[PDB]
């Protein structure tokens, strides 16, 4: 989290759980929580291999 | 940022076209009328000043007639300041071709050089155009009298008779109904005063608002003589043609 506001940080909590929700998990996993940082952020078109 | 304040004078519009050259021509339609007729024994050049005042010295003015070289004089219609520069370039280039080839410069060469200069500014540099329109009266042995108009786009077209400046549509139509192939300078003197009389915005046309010059081969020893008429001979020739 770098230059997130405390509203953005609340956003990562909810987002994490939604991704768990799709998988069908009964808990939120650590793997899913980070995945939620990346989804709160606008850049989620990810690599195109012009960063390799 | 510098880029922030750039005009971009010199991109195309969606039409395929150059806003700033179009606008330049818009402002030359404000400027003073100049007409040139190529007779078969001369060229008569006559232009009507865009301003007039009675306190204004108009007796030794020559702000429309400018001589480029001994055998080629031009009439000016547009941004006079921009024109003064290219007249002084032209004069440098004309004298240059004579220095290096020892031969009178053809009309074609000087006219094409001036055109390409205008052309450089609409092409690149990020600069405004030179809004000038020249009518070139010129003599060469090869093609006789040659007559020419150049625009801010930096394009040149031959004429036999042409009119630039204010009231272009009006002047052009008039020339055409009268113009014959068998005309000498006398018929040309009469027509040049006469078209100017129909486009005029003064209650009567007078000599102090006319500038007038000819180039005749009928000067002695089969030589071209450039004459810019004095305002007191113009007033005389104005009594002859019975305009006043």
């Amino acid at each position: 989290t770098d230059e997130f506001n405390g509203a953005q940080l609340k956003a990562v909590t909810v987002e994490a759980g939604m991704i768990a929700l799709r998988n069908g998990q009964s808990s939120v996993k650590h793997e899913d929580f980070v995945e939620g940082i990346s989804e709160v952020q606008a850049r989620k078109s990810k690599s195109v291999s012009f960063y390799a | 940022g510098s880029r922030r304040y750039d005009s971009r004078t010199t991109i195309f519009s969606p039409e395929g076209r150059l806003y700033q050259v179009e606008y330049a021509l818009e402002s030359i339609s404000h400027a003073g009328t100049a007409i040139g007729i190529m007779a078969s024994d001369g060229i008569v050049l006559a232009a009507e000043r865009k301003v007039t005042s009675t306190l204004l010295e108009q007796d030794t003015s020559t702000e429309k007639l400018y001589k480029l070289n001994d055998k080629i004089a031009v009439a000016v219609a547009g941004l006079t300041a921009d024109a003064e520069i290219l007249i002084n370039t032209a004069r440098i280039h004309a004298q240059n071709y004579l220095k290096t080839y020892n031969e009178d410069i053809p009309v074609e060469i000087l006219v094409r050089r001036l055109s390409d200069i205008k052309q450089g500014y609409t092409q690149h540099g990020g600069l405004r155009p030179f809004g000038v329109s020249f009518i070139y009266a010129g003599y060469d042995d090869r093609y006789g009298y040659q007559l020419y108009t150049s625009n801010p786009s930096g394009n040149y077209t031959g004429w036999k008779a042409i009119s630039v400046g204010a009231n272009t549509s009006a002047a052009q139509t008039l020339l055409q109904m009268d113009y014959k192939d068998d005309m000498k300078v006398d018929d040309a003197i009469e027509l040049a005063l006469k078209t100017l009389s129909k486009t005029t915005d003064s209650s009567a046309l007078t000599y102090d608002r006319l500038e007038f010059a000819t180039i005749r081969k009928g000067a002695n020893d089969g030589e071209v003589y450039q004459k810019i008429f004095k305002p007191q001979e113009i007033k005389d020739i104005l009594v002859k043609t019975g305009i006043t």
Partner: protein
């Protein structure tokens, strides 16, 4: 100066090139058809405006060498900037390797000029498109190329450029045969003239035809010769 005036578009283009293409269409119309042993570039010449000279007013087709002719459509002002370079490169060819230019080579150079002005800082690109034609020296195969503002060139069997180029090219799909060119030079003049009188119209007083035959024969036809081909074609039709 150093600012870009040609910039990448979010589509996949540069807007100044698409724009420059629009510029060629607003110009007058030049047609190209090659015979078995001739090129013919004919061009539409104005005469809306009258008292215009014919001797001293420049033509649409300007001989670069004695065997390479260039015609142009689009801005008539810009045209002279591409041609001034093209003439000097031909004399440089003569200087440094010997032999006069080959038509393919001059077309590749002219293409490289427009190519460069599509990607150099502080220029717009030329709004002018060429039919560059001619003969190879010591050969007699007719060569007809057309280069365009992109900076891309194409060879063509017959082609047409300028206003209503799509309308004219349609005509040429239907009368010029790729397999059998017009059998002689004279048949080839009747084809270029047959094409022009669709769009240009308004007499034979607008039609110009330059014909080149191999071995450095450039001839530009007189108004009388033109009338004669227009009349024959009008009548036959």
């Amino acid at each position: 100066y150093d600012r870009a005036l040609s910039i990448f578009s979010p589509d996949g283009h540069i807007f100044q090139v698409e724009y420059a293409l629009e510029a060629v269409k607003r110009g007058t119309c030049a047609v190209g058809v090659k015979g078995k042993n001739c090129v013919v570039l004919g061009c539409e010449r104005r005469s809306t405006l009258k008292l215009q000279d014919t001797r001293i007013t420049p033509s649409k087709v300007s001989k670069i060498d004695s065997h390479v002719v260039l015609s142009f459509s689009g801005l008539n002002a810009d045209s002279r900037i591409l041609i001034e370079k093209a003439r000097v490169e031909a004399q440089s060819h003569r200087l440094t390797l010997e032999d006069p230019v080959t038509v393919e080579y001059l077309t590749r150079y002219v293409a490289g000029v427009q190519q460069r002005y599509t990607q150099s800082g502080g220029v717009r690109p030329f709004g002018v498109s060429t039919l560059i034609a001619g003969f190879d020296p010591r050969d007699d195969e007719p060569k007809l190329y057309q280069t365009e503002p992109s900076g891309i060139y194409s060879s063509w069997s017959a082609q047409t450029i300028g206003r209503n180029s799509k309308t004219v090219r349609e005509f040429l799909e239907k009368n010029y045969d790729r397999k059998e060119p017009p059998a002689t030079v004279e048949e080839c003049v009747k084809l270029t003239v047959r094409s022009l009188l669709e769009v240009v119209q308004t007499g034979a007083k607008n039609i110009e035809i330059t014909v080149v035959k191999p071995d450095s024969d450039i001839v530009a036809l007189s108004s009388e010769e033109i009338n004669q081909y227009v009349t024959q074609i009008e009548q036959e039709k």
